[PDB]
Amino acid sequence: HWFYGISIGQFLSCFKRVFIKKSRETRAARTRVDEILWLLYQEVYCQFSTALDKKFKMIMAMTMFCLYKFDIESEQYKEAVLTMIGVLSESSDGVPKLTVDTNNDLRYLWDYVTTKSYISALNWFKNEFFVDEWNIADVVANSENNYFTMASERDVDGTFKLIELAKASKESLKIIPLGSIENLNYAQEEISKSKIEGGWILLQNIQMSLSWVKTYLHKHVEETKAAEEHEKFKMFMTCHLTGDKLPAPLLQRTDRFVYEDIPGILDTVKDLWGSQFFTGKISGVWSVYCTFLLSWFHALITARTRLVPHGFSKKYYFNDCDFQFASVYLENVLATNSTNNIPWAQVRDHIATIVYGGKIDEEKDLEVVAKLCAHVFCGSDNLQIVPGVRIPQPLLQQSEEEERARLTAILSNTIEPADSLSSWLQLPRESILNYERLQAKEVASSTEQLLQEM
Amino acid sequence: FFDPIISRLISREFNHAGNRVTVEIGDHEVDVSGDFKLFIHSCDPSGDIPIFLRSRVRLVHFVTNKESIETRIFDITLTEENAEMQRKRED
Amino acid sequence: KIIGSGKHHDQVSKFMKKMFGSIESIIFLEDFITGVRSVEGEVLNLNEKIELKDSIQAQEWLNILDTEIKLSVFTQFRDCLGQLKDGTDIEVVVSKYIFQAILLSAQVMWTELVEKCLQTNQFSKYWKEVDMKIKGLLDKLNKSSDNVKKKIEALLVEYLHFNNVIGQLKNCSTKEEARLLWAKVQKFYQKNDTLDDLNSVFISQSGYLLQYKFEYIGIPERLIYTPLLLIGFATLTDSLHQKYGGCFFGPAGTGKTETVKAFGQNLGRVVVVFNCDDSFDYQVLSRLLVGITQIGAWGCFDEFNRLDEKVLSAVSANIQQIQNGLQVGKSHITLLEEETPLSPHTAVFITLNPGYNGRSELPENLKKSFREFSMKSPQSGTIAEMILQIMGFEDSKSLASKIVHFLELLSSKCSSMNHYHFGLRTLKGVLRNCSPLISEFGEGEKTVVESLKRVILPSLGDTDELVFKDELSKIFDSAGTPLNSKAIVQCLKDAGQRSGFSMSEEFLKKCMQFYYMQKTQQALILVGKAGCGKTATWKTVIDAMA
Amino acid sequence: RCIINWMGDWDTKTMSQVANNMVDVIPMEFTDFIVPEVNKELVFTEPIQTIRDAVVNILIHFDRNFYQKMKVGVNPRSPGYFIDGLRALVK
Ligand SMILES: Nc1ncnc2c1ncn2[C@@H]1O[C@H](COP(=O)(O)OP(=O)(O)OP(=O)(O)O)[C@@H](O)[C@H]1O
Ligand SMILES: Nc1ncnc2c1ncn2[C@@H]1O[C@H](COP(=O)(O)OP(=O)(O)O)[C@@H](O)[C@H]1O
């Protein structure tokens, strides 16, 4: 992958810092050098996991576990774990193996495989290794390079995470949304100032910045060799995995981190509702009611779009702009129409065919969105938005403070069940199970091609 | 890159006089000095280089140390893991 | 050239087509601007004859005529609305006013009438009235002159759309469904109380109010109304209402550029269409962009999917600047290294034809300012039925269904190869080419069969004509008889004998195909195996027709 | 029209004779040779009596072994490193 590049110097630096990290007591096992080597594994895994996404994180984790264990253990253990991983990749499935009272880990793995908890069977590799997973703060503080790439997809961001990290320690963030040539020269003068000032900075969507960063920022980073002695500024550039390829010298010079913190569905409703409502209401109780309804709908569609091919035949990206357009359309139709259930059908059609159906190009996905919209919007008398929450209509006295209070309370008190991916989303449990099956197949397969490569 | 104007020096080609050393370069019998030293530096190793220089010029690998690895991390370990006897040997 | 020769004030007339795109000639009485004539030859009468003196520069009276033509359009609209309001048939009106005025007046009148009918739920009477109007316009069209026949067909497009709307809403049972469909379709309104005559008329669709502009369009071909077209219009106006430019994407042969062109058409705008990535330099792009942002017109970047990276980046920067200027609303924008005013009415639309991989997308810097909309296959059956109705028919419904089914079956059956194309363009070509053949032949389905033979058949491989005739026999049962061959075949035989060429039924068929299909097409491509008499073929046809 | 002459890389006779001719200047060092009864089967030269033949044979052996190891199969490259190696040896 283009982003997953690596340098010799990074490996040697991590190797050097393996030793002087005499932080946590290593396991009281064979000799000193063996535990030093195991600590080397733990350190390199902790450092280099942050540059890899969840799937690659997992495959590298298990492959590295196998690399350690095959060399450190007996032939029986090696062939048993080989049979286990073959069972995981049912394209190379075999017969399970049993070692009596010796390797409790393998019984746990076989239990996870049999119990259809494939994701737990995977995560066992990381859990057993007693690793110390990191966040942005740990990698930023511990690393010495001033540059960091804020890798993510086009549907989730760490901007709020970075802002709250700054507010947690030393602040100094200067969000610089790059854009037009005026935006361009403002950004370059800002970074020139921040080089001496040493304040934190953040640039948005380096992909669209491609020309400027190739011409200016790449050259500036090349020239900033001795300038790192200046006040301790933090360089944060947001890059998108599906975006255009970034120049190799720039990505190599900087440090890399990727974001995977996908908030829960209830969390999505929480933060979308808060960010939408803190600007103040416009019209009567029905306005905030339909705003709540469309916020929930946006949460469901954002949830469903993360599953491919189960649900949608292909991946889509729903930007907030759709949310603003939905809000504007609902506000306008409510202002135009009287306080009745009259415009529900037309609002549903408009949302499913223009606001959210415009991007989509598959009649199956159009039908899915249409049925979801009909379920969520059409109806009255305590609509069951999710099987665990009942949403009644606004009452006849039309007070909006009580409505906002009741909406916030019903959002807070209600809890999200673990099966929300299959319960809140109208998907058969077979669908999600086969999704986990496909995930296990792809990760495990890649792990074989890796291991036969060695 | 390579042009056959330094050809008369990449391969020994000098019409020495009785007491003066001359080389036919371009259109001038350019003067030479005993302290003149020329060294060709390359940017990347993957790029193909002309065969004539490979015949003549003395290639030396200062390339990035991807291979081996054992030597570098071995040096790091000896300088780091109980270094006293290792560098006391050099002492 | 125009400035240095601004004395004859007639040499500019052949320039002003480029700088309006709707009009190409200007009328002169003796030295005064009597009016203008559009590309289809429709003559616009200007109420205020602009007197010209030798001192006034060209651009000054150009500026005055910009507003003068719009004022005349509004006045003709007012007269047409007044004449229609007091119960007058459209037929006596079609010969009096311009096509724009009659179309917009009919739209407003129909809007009000269907509003009151929806308030009363008595659509049967209005449906009958519309049907009689359709029949009267149909029978008037036959004996009319072509110059006005263009007007009759153009208005019949909108009247057919209205009749379809009325019928489908009458079939709808609930008041709520009626309101749904009525808000779904475009709705016309005017404000007489407002003193500003230019903005006295406006369009309302999906609850969004857009101000109509009385800019002149002439009589461009009317894009028939289809559901998918209505969704396209709705998404376009929704994107515009929040000052975001529209963005259409999808497979080729979907009329996306034609869709936005029809949008500007019925909304009263000349959408400057720039076909892109053919030979064109960035400087003229900057010039036209500055012009459109200074005048308030609308631009569409046809075939925007393909561009070289540097020009694409430059135009993306410029378009991001202008779109953000619309967003903020600042009067001046510093684009093209110069402070330029920005009209509030300026808007930009983009079309994305499929790439080598298929789905082609805008540069990511535009994602925050545009709304991509996929475009599906248009309702070819509906458009074929409407065209057959507007050309007069007997069984247009099943005939259009048969034509669409036959074209799809031809696409599925015959071998696929690079130049084969059975998209909407081919069907449109058949329906636009049959008309002289319809005049020569009857109006029966056999005339359509002959048009199919004269258009698609001579561009196939041997097995492909085998499949073509097999499916022609399967679907249609009209074979036809040879006609007007008693002379052209004799001429071909004489030419072959005088050239020493052996006439053959293969050769005769190829020559007949070429002669038939050269009448319409201007520039011809001839393809066949090396030295297969193609030179001889066109020699024979050319001297035989001589 | 042109006459083509395939010269190719030098063979064992060529290296033996040529390196003999050059090491004519320095075929001998202090005291005498290490015991000159090594295997004669792989001797491309005349029987060993000084260092001369052992040196030329070891040089040619290393040369073709390095060529057959660095590449695989046909090696269309003549010994150029041989000349630099022998110059370094004599100097
Ligand atoms: N109708 C005909 N009757 C008899 N002979 C014919 C007839 N048409 C063509 N020929 C013969 O066939 C040959 C025509 O080949 P020609 O090169 O003209 O074909 P082409 O495909 O148009 O050309 P090219 O491939 O060379 O550009 C000539 O030998 C000509 O005499
Ligand atoms: N609703 C419609 N009714 C009749 N003809 C149409 C309709 N939509 C498109 N067409 C025809 O189909 C053709 C397809 O145009 P196309 O090449 O898709 O435009 P673009 O340049 O946007 O790709 C157009 O020439 C147009 O005449």
Side-chain angles (χ1 to χ4, degrees), chain A residues 175-328:
Chain A
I175 317 297
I176 303 306
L178 190 149
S180 67
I181 297 167
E182 185 271 329
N183 202 342
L184 290 172
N185 64 7
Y186 181 76
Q188 64 195 93
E189 73 185 5
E190 193 72 28
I191 193 49
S192 302
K193 290 191 293 299
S194 304
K195 177 195 283 183
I196 306 175
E197 295 150 354
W200 291 16
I201 200 167
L202 172 58
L203 323 177
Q204 324 314 124
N205 307 56
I206 312 304
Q207 283 70 234
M208 61 79 71
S209 312
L210 193 42
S211 46
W212 187 79
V213 299
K214 175 64 179 69
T215 57
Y216 181 95
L217 183 63
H218 171 260
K219 270 72 170 179
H220 169 84
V221 167
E222 288 191 309
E223 297 298 329
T224 48
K225 291 313 173 190
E228 59 96 8
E229 292 295 304
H230 301 169
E231 293 191 59
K232 300 327 207 298
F233 42 69
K234 266 62 180 173
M235 295 299 102
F236 298 130
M237 284 73 74
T238 66
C239 59
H240 297 317
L241 273 298
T242 55
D244 302 322
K245 196 255 178 196
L246 270 293
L250 181 63
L251 183 54
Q252 199 43 259
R253 161 88 175 280
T254 181
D255 307 337
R256 315 167 197 207
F257 174 83
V258 60
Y259 206 74
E260 280 82 5
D261 297 331
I262 305 161
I265 314 306
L266 173 57
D267 302 327
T268 307
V269 169
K270 273 322 171 183
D271 61 356
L272 269 296
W273 174 237
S275 51
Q276 157 85 11
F277 183 64
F278 90 92
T279 186
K281 87 162 195 63
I282 297 89
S283 73
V285 56
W286 282 115
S287 167
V288 285
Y289 191 73
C290 64
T291 300
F292 175 85
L293 294 174
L294 61 83
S295 301
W296 260 94
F297 153 79
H298 191 99
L300 280 293
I301 178 68
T302 302
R304 178 179 295 262
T305 189
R306 215 166 291 102
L307 317 175
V308 175
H310 278 292
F312 294 146
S313 192
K314 49 193 294 184
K315 194 181 194 299
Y316 301 127
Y317 313 88
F318 285 95
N319 188 291
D320 294 358
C321 297
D322 309 332
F323 196 94
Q324 280 87 20
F325 290 166
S327 63
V328 169

Side-chain angles (χ1 to χ4, degrees), chain C residues 47-90:
Chain C
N47 316 133
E48 292 78 2
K49 65 179 73 175
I50 297 172
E51 288 79 7
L52 310 182
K53 306 281 303 312
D54 291 327
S55 51
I56 294 89
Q57 301 179 27
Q59 77 288 346
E60 293 136 9
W61 51 260
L62 276 180
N63 267 310
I64 196 66
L65 62 84
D66 299 316
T67 73
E68 203 57 68
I69 59 186
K70 306 165 65 161
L71 294 174
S72 192
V73 162
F74 168 79
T75 309
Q76 284 216 31
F77 181 76
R78 187 255 300 162
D79 312 334
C80 181
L81 199 61
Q83 271 195 275
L84 295 174
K85 271 291 174 72
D86 45 353
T88 307
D89 280 338
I90 297 90

Side-chain angles (χ1 to χ4, degrees), chain C residues 134-416:
Chain C
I134 297 298
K135 299 321 210 324
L137 291 153
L138 279 169
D139 76 2
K140 170 162 202 300
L141 172 61
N142 308 116
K143 306 162 297 306
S144 308
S145 73
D146 67 333
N147 183 44
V148 68
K149 276 165 60 51
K150 277 163 280 179
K151 299 181 110 147
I152 296 89
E153 51 205 290
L155 58 90
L156 272 173
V157 172
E158 268 74 1
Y159 291 166
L160 282 169
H161 161 63
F162 295 160
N163 188 11
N164 171 43
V165 162
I166 299 319
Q168 63 84 30
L169 68 89
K170 174 172 54 180
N171 319 321
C172 290
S173 65
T174 80
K175 290 287 283 189
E176 172 52 36
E177 283 169 340
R179 279 170 299 248
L180 161 65
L181 61 92
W182 173 232
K184 181 70 72 175
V185 76
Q186 286 194 137
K187 303 165 285 296
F188 287 81
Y189 295 104
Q190 77 283 16
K191 275 178 311 200
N192 62 6
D193 61 357
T194 288
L195 73 164
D196 177 19
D197 287 357
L198 289 193
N199 311 341
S200 43
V201 182
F202 52 98
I203 192 66
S204 173
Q205 187 194 2
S206 298
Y208 290 123
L209 279 298
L210 275 296
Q211 199 60 53
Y212 178 85
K213 285 181 59 183
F214 275 69
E215 199 275 332
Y216 186 56
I217 206 65
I219 297 169
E221 48 88 18
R222 285 306 310 166
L223 205 44
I224 192 66
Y225 283 59
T226 70
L228 186 147
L229 171 77
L230 274 296
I231 296 89
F233 279 1
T235 185
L236 184 62
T237 177
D238 212 336
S239 301
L240 188 153
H241 184 259
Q242 283 72 249
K243 315 302 284 167
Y244 276 9
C247 167
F248 287 175
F249 71 90
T254 53
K256 299 179 290 293
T257 56
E258 288 79 346
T259 305
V260 285
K261 277 209 293 170
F263 188 94
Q265 211 170 318
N266 57 33
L267 183 63
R269 286 176 171 265
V270 168
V271 179
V272 59
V273 171
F274 170 81
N275 63 6
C276 196
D277 198 3
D278 303 333
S279 59
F280 302 142
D281 166 36
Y282 172 78
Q283 208 287 320
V284 67
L285 273 298
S286 305
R287 206 180 74 250
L288 66 94
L289 183 63
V290 164
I292 64 177
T293 186
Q294 280 194 250
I295 196 62
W298 291 354
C300 294
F301 288 60
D302 188 2
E303 186 66 26
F304 187 78
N305 54 304
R306 46 168 272 147
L307 284 173
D308 60 299
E309 292 79 1
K310 55 170 297 299
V311 162
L312 193 142
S313 183
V315 65
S316 178
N318 308 319
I319 209 67
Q320 174 52 260
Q321 179 66 40
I322 178 62
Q323 200 57 258
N324 187 45
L326 277 296
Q327 307 315 320
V328 173
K330 55 169 179 281
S331 181
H332 295 285
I333 48 171
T334 316
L335 196 67
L336 206 51
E337 59 270 9
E338 169 54 89
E339 206 73 26
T340 60
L342 161 56
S343 305
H345 315 327
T346 303
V348 159
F349 319 110
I350 308 296
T351 63
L352 293 192
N353 287 115
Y356 40 87
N357 182 294
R359 180 69 177 89
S360 300
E361 306 192 328
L362 305 173
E364 52 273 22
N365 49 2
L366 303 192
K367 255 68 172 172
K368 189 265 180 154
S369 60
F370 274 81
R371 296 308 314 298
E372 303 87 318
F373 177 46
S374 180
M375 201 65 98
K376 301 301 177 87
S377 160
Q379 274 52 56
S380 47
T382 302
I383 66 170
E385 166 183 349
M386 295 298 102
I387 295 162
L388 284 156
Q389 276 194 250
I390 191 167
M391 60 79 71
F393 64 91
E394 314 163 342
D395 192 69
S396 55
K397 267 281 199 184
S398 302
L399 195 151
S401 297
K402 282 202 135 181
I403 296 299
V404 178
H405 171 217
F406 172 73
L407 266 294
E408 304 162 272
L409 184 62
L410 168 67
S411 179
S412 169
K413 282 283 212 304
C414 290
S415 74
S416 66

